[PDB]
Scaffold this active site. Structure first.
Site, PDB file in Angstrom:
ATOM      1  N   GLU A  35      26.799 -18.157 -30.438  1.00 20.55           N
ATOM      2  CA  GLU A  35      27.113 -19.422 -31.131  1.00 20.55           C
ATOM      3  C   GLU A  35      28.271 -19.222 -32.104  1.00 20.55           C
ATOM      4  OE1 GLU A  35      26.255 -22.206 -30.305  1.00 20.55           O
ATOM      5  OE2 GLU A  35      24.282 -22.075 -29.344  1.00 20.55           O
ATOM      6  N   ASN A  46      32.385 -31.670 -31.475  1.00 24.61           N
ATOM      7  CA  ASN A  46      31.973 -32.097 -30.126  1.00 24.61           C
ATOM      8  C   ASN A  46      32.704 -33.373 -29.759  1.00 24.61           C
ATOM      9  OD1 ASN A  46      29.977 -30.002 -29.680  1.00 24.61           O
ATOM     10  ND2 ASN A  46      28.989 -30.971 -31.416  1.00 24.61           N
ATOM     11  N   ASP A  48      31.495 -36.193 -28.903  1.00 18.80           N
ATOM     12  CA  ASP A  48      30.731 -37.354 -29.431  1.00 18.80           C
ATOM     13  C   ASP A  48      31.042 -37.575 -30.922  1.00 18.80           C
ATOM     14  OD1 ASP A  48      29.100 -35.417 -30.650  1.00 18.80           O
ATOM     15  OD2 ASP A  48      27.305 -35.883 -29.481  1.00 18.80           O
ATOM     16  N   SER A  50      30.117 -35.520 -33.342  1.00 19.96           N
ATOM     17  CA  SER A  50      29.229 -34.638 -34.118  1.00 19.96           C
ATOM     18  C   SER A  50      29.916 -33.273 -34.302  1.00 19.96           C
ATOM     19  CB  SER A  50      27.830 -34.476 -33.532  1.00 19.96           C
ATOM     20  OG  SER A  50      27.895 -33.714 -32.341  1.00 19.96           O
ATOM     21  N   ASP A  52      29.050 -28.956 -35.087  1.00 16.06           N
ATOM     22  CA  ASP A  52      28.095 -27.833 -35.166  1.00 16.06           C
ATOM     23  C   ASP A  52      28.504 -26.908 -36.310  1.00 16.06           C
ATOM     24  OD1 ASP A  52      27.100 -28.789 -32.718  1.00 16.06           O
ATOM     25  OD2 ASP A  52      28.562 -27.562 -31.628  1.00 16.06           O
ATOM     26  N   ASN A  59      23.705 -28.771 -35.228  1.00 17.68           N
ATOM     27  CA  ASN A  59      24.450 -30.034 -34.993  1.00 17.68           C
ATOM     28  C   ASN A  59      24.074 -31.166 -35.965  1.00 17.68           C
ATOM     29  OD1 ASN A  59      26.206 -31.404 -32.713  1.00 17.68           O
ATOM     30  ND2 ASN A  59      24.434 -32.739 -33.054  1.00 17.68           N
TER      31      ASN A  59
END
Ligand SMILES: [Cl-]
Ligand SMILES: [Cl-]
Ligand SMILES: [Cl-]
Ligand SMILES: [Cl-]
Ligand SMILES: [Cl-]
Ligand SMILES: [Cl-]
Ligand SMILES: [Cl-]
Ligand code: NA
Length: 129
Positions: A35, A46, A48, A50, A52, A59
């Site tokens: 990650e 992301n 969308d 959002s 992380d 998220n």
């Protein structure tokens, strides 16, 4: 902060992640490797909108507030910035909520694709724990 492998294994054990929801410490170290490469300041946007955050790339759609993810929740009740701290307490406490959500560590797509079913005990080999 960029953690060492064994340094992070130790910190995660210190905060009770080892065997949390039945996931051995090597599963958590492996997820953090892929990650964030063990970097608490990792971020990823992301498609969308959002974002992380942090060593386990948690998220903003569900788990933290960043003020820029429309319609999102903050189920960990933290600013997403808390997930970038050198102190992993906020990331670990939030990860415990996520892994309890029903799909276990499959919530981390990188864990499913790169760690699940592999010899994850390699990730803690050599470490004084
Ligand atoms: Cl490594
Ligand atoms: Cl392990
Ligand atoms: Cl928001
Ligand atoms: Cl909420
Ligand atoms: Cl906030
Ligand atoms: Cl820590
Ligand atoms: Cl499970
Ligand atoms: Na949010």
């Amino acid at each position: 902060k960029v953690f060492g492998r064994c340094e992070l294994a130790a910190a995660m054990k210190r905060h009770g992640l080892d065997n949390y929801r039945g996931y051995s410490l090597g599963n958590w170290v492996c997820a953090a490797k892929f990650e964030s490469n063990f970097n608490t300041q990792a971020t990823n946007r992301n498609t969308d909108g959002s974002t992380d955050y942090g060593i386990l790339q948690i998220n903003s759609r569900w788990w933290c507030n960043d003020g820029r993810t429309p319609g999102s929740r903050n189920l960990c009740n933290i600013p997403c910035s808390a997930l970038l701290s050198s102190d992993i307490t906020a990331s670990v406490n939030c990860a415990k909520k996520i892994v309890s959500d029903g799909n276990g560590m499959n919530a981390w797509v990188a864990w499913r694709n790169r760690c699940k079913g592999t010899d994850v005990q390699a990730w803690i080999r050599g470490c004084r724990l």
